[PDB]
Design a protein around this ligand. Sequence first.
Ligand SMILES: CN(C)C[C@@H]1CCn2cc(c3ccccc32)C2=C(C(=O)NC2=O)c2cn(c3ccccc23)CCO1
Length: 273
Amino acid sequence: PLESQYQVGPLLGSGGFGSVYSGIRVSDNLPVAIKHVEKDRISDWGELPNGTRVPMEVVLLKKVSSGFSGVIRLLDWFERPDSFVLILERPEPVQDLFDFITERGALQEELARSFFWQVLEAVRHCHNCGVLHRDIKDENILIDLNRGELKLIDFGSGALLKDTVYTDFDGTRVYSPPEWIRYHRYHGRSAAVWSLGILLYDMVCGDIPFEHDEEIIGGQVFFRQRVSSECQHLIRWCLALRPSDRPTFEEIQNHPWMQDVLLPQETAEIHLH
Ligand SMILES: CN(C)C[C@@H]1CCn2cc(c3ccccc32)C2=C(C(=O)NC2=O)c2cn(c3ccccc23)CCO1
């Protein structure tokens, strides 16, 4: 049972993703996060190979949780009469990227480069596992402050990756692409790249570029902070109005701005320790 197997600590947060508590695995004192969601609040369902009816979140997490990666891994899950409970990794010490940027302001480009590179590798991992996250944003990125490693959280808005059109979106609006605003249609990979452009801007400017729909569809990116010409170019490319004009993951990682990335360890030593 969950209750004897885990020592439950304080609430870490709650919202659309349910309620998440800090925890410790009793057997070996592993730090964990314990996520509860009411069955009545679960819109998207899937099934395991053996036909157990589970939240799609569990299917997606299982797909991305094999091997080591920049994704918070699903360690176990439990079904209760009225809810599911998910046991996730918890780094320590940790801070989400939203809080990090709020506290420290716009990031030095060396740090933004290391962070952005890691998110790109994590997103490539998800896509290789057949999973689209669909809510990439600063709030869903955890920084392991000692190891300098970034981890993606919250697959609650995600989907199985497909090559055909998506007509549903329950992710974060201001990180949502103009084709969604205009047509309620997007393709996974090019929508992902849009969200990555928003994230990169957020990192080097300290806030997101667009508030209103009209800015999102407008085709203009204004820089409020000093940002290098190469970084501006990459951001503007990721934020191309036409989805087909956006870079692939390969083209992003080959962009001149992305060269000579720091290792996670170096990043921690220079910027986080
Ligand atoms: C807005 N929301 C996403 C923020 C998040 C919200 C609470 N939350 C923590 C959380 C997740 C995962 C998926 C959805 C929501 C989560 C997890 C962790 C974690 O280490 N493993 C997790 O699974 C944490 C996220 N955070 C942690 C802070 C301190 C300890 C642990 C934290 C970030 C703050 O809470």
